[PDB]
Design a protein around this ligand. Structure first.
Ligand code: 662
Ligand code: CL
Ligand code: CL
Ligand code: MG
Length: 213
């Protein structure tokens, strides 16, 4: 029996179905009082919320769902008709994420795809009828942020103005991605200093807006 399952169970035992805020609060409580987990957390989550509200994206892609905390956070702020696609390679996590979103009442706004980003990304246009993405949240293995950003561009999924938002650019860090976007004339970057989830350790988010080829 796993930490991720215990988080889901705590949410089901404690939170209110159909109430996304209650779900986020239950997770944050569990992870503060019982067992730490790598959810984006409330400190960085508040920055995410502010970014999402500012840009009002119609189509968001998330890479790495884990237990669905960030999916709940984002989906709850989407305008009617806007959608989130989230990719999660681990089948157990994909199931936890789906159940988390079901419990929150957000399942109508989110599609959880169980597979590898590098396999699914090239299918988005043909199989999922995507044109371009308005926002991308990166929170999967940190060494895959750069390879997947480059793949998104190759597949024609980025447009002028697409907002990339990357977790953990300080800890654990994503040094190739961060150096790449900050050095590239095709991205305009902003750093949001914050704290590692549930810890008094500095971390941050990077926002990188695609400028076109
Ligand atoms: C190759 C397949 C790629 N394609 C993929 N396609 C689809 N899904 C993918 C792909 N690659 C991975 N995933 C999924 O994303 C998730 C993985 C997320 C990884 N996140 C961290 O490692 C982290 C660590 C810390 C941390 C900080 C301080 C510490 F002391 C300890 C830990 C903090 C944080 O906020 C962190 O997000 C999920 C578990 C995993 O199955
Ligand atoms: Cl998360
Ligand atoms: Cl936090
Ligand atoms: Mg993270």
């Amino acid at each position: 029996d796993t930490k991720e399952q215990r988080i889901l169970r705590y949410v089901q035992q404690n939170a209110k179905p159909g109430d996304p805020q209650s779900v986020l609060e239950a997770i944050d409580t569990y992870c503060t009082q019982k067992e730490w987990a790598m959810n984006v957390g409330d400190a960085k989550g508040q920055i995410m919320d502010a970014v999402i509200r500012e840009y009002s994206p119609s189509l968001v892609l998330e890479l790495g769902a884990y237990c669905g905390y960030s999916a709940v956070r984002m989906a709850r702020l989407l305008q009617p008709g806007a959608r989130l696609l989230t990719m999660e390679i681990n089948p157990d996590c994909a199931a936890i994420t789906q159940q988390m979103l079901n419990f929150a009442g957000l399942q109508d706004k989110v599609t959880i795809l169980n597979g590898a980003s590098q396999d699914l990304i090239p299918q988005l246009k043909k199989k999922y009828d995507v044109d371009t993405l308005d926002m991308v949240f990166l929170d999967h293995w940190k060494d895959r942020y750069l390879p997947d950003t480059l793949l998104l561009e190759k597949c024609g999924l980025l447009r002028k103005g697409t907002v990339l938002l990357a977790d953990n650019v300080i800890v654990p860090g994503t040094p190739d991605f961060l150096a790449y976007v900050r050095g590239s004339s095709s991205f305009e970057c902003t750093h949001y200093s914050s704290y590692l989830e549930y810890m008094k350790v500095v971390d941050g988010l990077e926002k990188a807006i695609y400028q076109g080829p």
